[PDB]
Each structure stands twice: as structure tokens, then as C-alpha cells.
Amino acid sequence: HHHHMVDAAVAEKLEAGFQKLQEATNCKSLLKKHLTREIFDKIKDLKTSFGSTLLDVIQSGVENLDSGFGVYAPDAEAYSVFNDLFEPMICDYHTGFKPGDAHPPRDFGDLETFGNLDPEGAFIVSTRVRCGRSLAGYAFNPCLTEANYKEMEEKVVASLSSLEGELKGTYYPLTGMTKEVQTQLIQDRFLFKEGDRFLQAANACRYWPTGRGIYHNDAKTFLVWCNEEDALRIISMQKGGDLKAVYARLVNAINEIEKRIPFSHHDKYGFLTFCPTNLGTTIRASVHIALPKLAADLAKLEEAAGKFNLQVRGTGGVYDISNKRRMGLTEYQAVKEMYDGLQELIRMEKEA
């Protein structure tokens, strides 16, 4: 498709959408905040080579004015063609990344440099690390054909089915999924279904449930979703606080998948994802930790965690601790911010 010219129908819906955002005087989305009339007028007639327009970017945040973010990338090239809108939204949302920065090449780092965080189990309830990936050579959800979903699933399942040892497990397609399996996966908190209204409006649920499925290892410490928001959502999780083991399992899985399937990647934004909140390392690390002594002063807790760019959220003195930074640092740096921040928080708890 050409870089220029959208048809009259698309132009008309785009104008109607801008007006709807403006008429919404109280709308809080980053879309409303960053799509100025000047940016809109500059990029409204552009297209990617896949034929995606600005409407394929903003429609979800127009249909759902209460979105927090409110745009998605219909294909990898949208991040460039429509960078005038994506850039300010990305650099607003993410911590420590600014226009002109280039996200570093992937580096999981030296796993041996991770210690043991809470061997006794006195503090940390559970530990999770989540990543996402898109498959190189395909558009993203709004542009995928029925044939695309089938081919991506075949490739993903070929990789997952060959996982050995710690990672060995079972793939469950959504296509034909039995009520028995739905019930079992719900109990494990492993099931996804057809997307909510934000994904529906983004045209991310086309040809449902073709190409969609759920994989987990037998120990239920490794989970993969195929074709939900991204081609791959990859999670390592376990009870207790052994961040080294959780991260090592994740690294082993992603490396093994990459040997067969390259991932969509951008020179400045890192790994490309359907929602721009998942860019860079894509890392969403989360530890539930009991800090009842530090709970007497939430501000010193928030402040101490913030020295390592960690976010504190009460869930009772139990907190969800997570990495603020996903872009502009390596995977090793992000997971080490969690390790070092949690180390300081535990020392503070013991000292109080």
C-alpha cells in the first residue's frame, strides 16, 4: 500500500472521532491529551504499507472514551508512520524514556548474579515476571488474515510442543475448547476469552477463536497465551520469593522460542507490541510481599522503593511491588531493579 491517501469514509470517521474526543471535555485518556489538532492535521492522510490508517490506531480510544491510553499499533510500521502521535504518548506513559533515546539491544544478563531473596519465606508471597512478543513477518491483530492466525499458531505450537524438562507441558486451543477445560483453566487463572470492549473496538478479535490458545507447564509455573493482545504473552510465576528461578525459567523459554521464531523489533522502541504500554523489554515483574512493620509509614515505603524505580500498591500490610521502567534499560537492569529494591525493603522491614 502507498504511504499517502486514505479514502473518504476513513477521512470522515477520523474527523468525527477527533470531534468526539474534543466534545468529551472531561476525557482523561493519553489519546485525548496528545492528539492535538495540529498533530491530527499532519498525519490524518498517511498509511502504512499494510494499509493501516490513523483510524486503525485511534478507533478504540474514540469508541471507549474512558480508555487510559487509547491507541494500539495495527502493524509494526504504524510506530513510524504515526510516530508524531505514538512518540509523545509512549514517552509520557513510560518512565525514563525521552524522544531521541534508543532502547538497548536485548540482554537478559548473568543469572548467577542473582542471590536468594527470601529463602525462609518470611516476606514474599509470590513472584511473577511477564513478557510479550510479536512475531516478525506479520502485521498485528487489526490486519491479520484468517490464514495468518492459523500459520502463526502452527509456528508457536511447534516451538512450545518441543519444550523439554522444566518447561514441558500441554497446549490447549481455544478452538473447540471444552467446558471441562474452560473450568480447569479458570481455576488456575489461566483462561482468556474474547477481548473486552477495548480490544473489540481495536479490531483485535477478528476470526475468533482461530489461532488462539493457552500453554502451561505441568508444574503451573510457566504460562503462554497465543494470539491474545500479542502473538505471545509469556509468564513465569511461583509461590515464594525465588526471583532467580522465576527469571531463569523465563529466559530459557524465550531463548528457546527465538531459536525458531524471530520477534518484531524496532531500533528505538525495542520489542514491538500491540499496546504501546508493553514496549522495550516488555517486562512486567510483580512480587506480592508482606511488610507489616513498614506498613506503618507508606510514604517512606514508597520513597525507598522509588530509589530503585519500583512502584508500591497495597493489595493488611501486603503490597504488590513492580518495575516502573520497561523502556530505556536492559532486561537485566529491570529485573535487577526489582531484586535490589526488594532487598532494601526487606532489610528495612527487618530493621524496623
Residue numbers in the entry: -3 to 311, 320 to 356
Lines from the paper:
AK from D. magna (DmAK) has four highly conserved histidine residues, namely, H90, H227, H284, and H315 in the amino acid sequence.
In the final refinement at 1.75 Å, Rwork and Rfree values of DmAK H227A were 0.181 and 0.224, respectively. The overall structure of DmAK H227A had 360 amino acids, 320 water molecules, and 1 ion each of PO43− and NO3−. Although cocrystallization with ADP and L-arginine substrates was conducted, their presence was not detected in the DmAK H227A structure. The root-mean-square deviation was estimated as 0.326 Å for Cα atoms in the superposition of DmAK WT and H227A. In the case of the DmAK H227A structure, the hydrogen bond destruction between A135 and H227, resulted in the replacement of one water molecule (WAT684) at the imidazole group of histidine position. In the crystal structure of DmAK H227A, the hydrogen bond disruption between H227 and A135 resulted in the lowered structural stability of DmAK H227A due to the weakness of α-helix formation of the FNPCL residues as also shown by CD signal data. The highly conserved H227 residue adjacent to the arginine binding site affected the structural stability of DmAK, and the turnover (Kcat) value of H227A decreased by about 17.9% compared to the wild type as shown by the enzyme kinetic results.
